[PDB]
Amino acid sequence: VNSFSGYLKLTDNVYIKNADIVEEAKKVKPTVVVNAANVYLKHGGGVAGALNKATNNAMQVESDDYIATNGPLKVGGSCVLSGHNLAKHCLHVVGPNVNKGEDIQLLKSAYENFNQHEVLLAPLLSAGIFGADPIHSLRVCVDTVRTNVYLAVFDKNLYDKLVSSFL
Numbered sequence: 001v002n003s004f005s006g007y008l009k010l011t012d013n014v015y016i017k018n019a020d021i022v023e024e025a026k027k028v029k030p031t032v033v034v035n036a037a038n039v040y041l042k043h044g045g046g047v048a049g050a051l052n053k054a055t056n057n058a059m060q061v062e063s064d065d066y067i068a069t070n071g072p073l074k075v076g077g078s079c080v081l082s083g084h085n086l087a088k089h090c091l092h093v094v095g096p097n098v099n100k101g102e103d104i105q106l107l108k109s110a111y112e113n114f115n116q117h118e119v120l121l122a123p124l125l126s127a128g129i130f131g132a133d134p135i136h137s138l139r140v141c142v143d144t145v146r147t148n149v150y151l152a153v154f155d156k157n158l159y160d161k162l163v164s165s166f167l
């Protein structure tokens with residue numbers, strides 16, 4: 001048993017809710033919140049901008065030190081950093097950005113990072129400003145992640161479409 005509340009169960013291990021991931025994280029304080037990161041960990045907008053804003057820019061400060069030491073992530077890759085006031089840890093995962101021409105096939109690799117964590121609160125990778133079809137992202141999530149994932153979908157109309165179209 002865990003403290004995630006109000007989720008619809010899609011599969012044995014995937015759950016979904018219409019929620020603002022920032023508010024969900026602040027309420028639940030999960031062990032792991034997933035950020036929709038880019039390779040430079042520049043948290044300017046979308047989920048990343050909102051998560052970083054909620055940390056009063058501490059996420060960005062930590063991220064800039066990480067990049068200065070390690071260089072950029074790979075598309076499809078991840079790193080574990082602090083969750084600040086939102087979670088114990090933040091798993092920064094880079095899904096392919098279709099608006100940059102990045103290979104949508106890398107979305108499966110991105111979701112594989114979730115399997116290193118028993119339970120996660122996460123957004124749909126490559127959705128929103130990353131330009132992929134969220135219905136496709138949900139399918140890849142369900143077919144790739146084997147650990148317990150709680151998906152927060154900000155947009156109510158999209159949430160309803162994701163549920164109603166789920167196979």
Ligand SMILES: CCOC(=O)Nc1cccc2c1[nH]c1ncnc(NN3CCCC3=O)c12
Pocket residue numbers: 019020021022023047050123124126127128129134152153154155158
């Ligand atoms: C002050 C904090 O409040 C907010 O950021 N609210 C808010 C506004 C607009 C969109 C989202 C949002 N929260 C979200 N959490 C998670 N995925 C969000 N969108 N995506 C990104 C990919 C698919 C999707 O529904 C949003």
Ligand SMILES: [Cl-]
Pocket residue numbers: 045046047127128129130
């Ligand atoms: Cl977004």
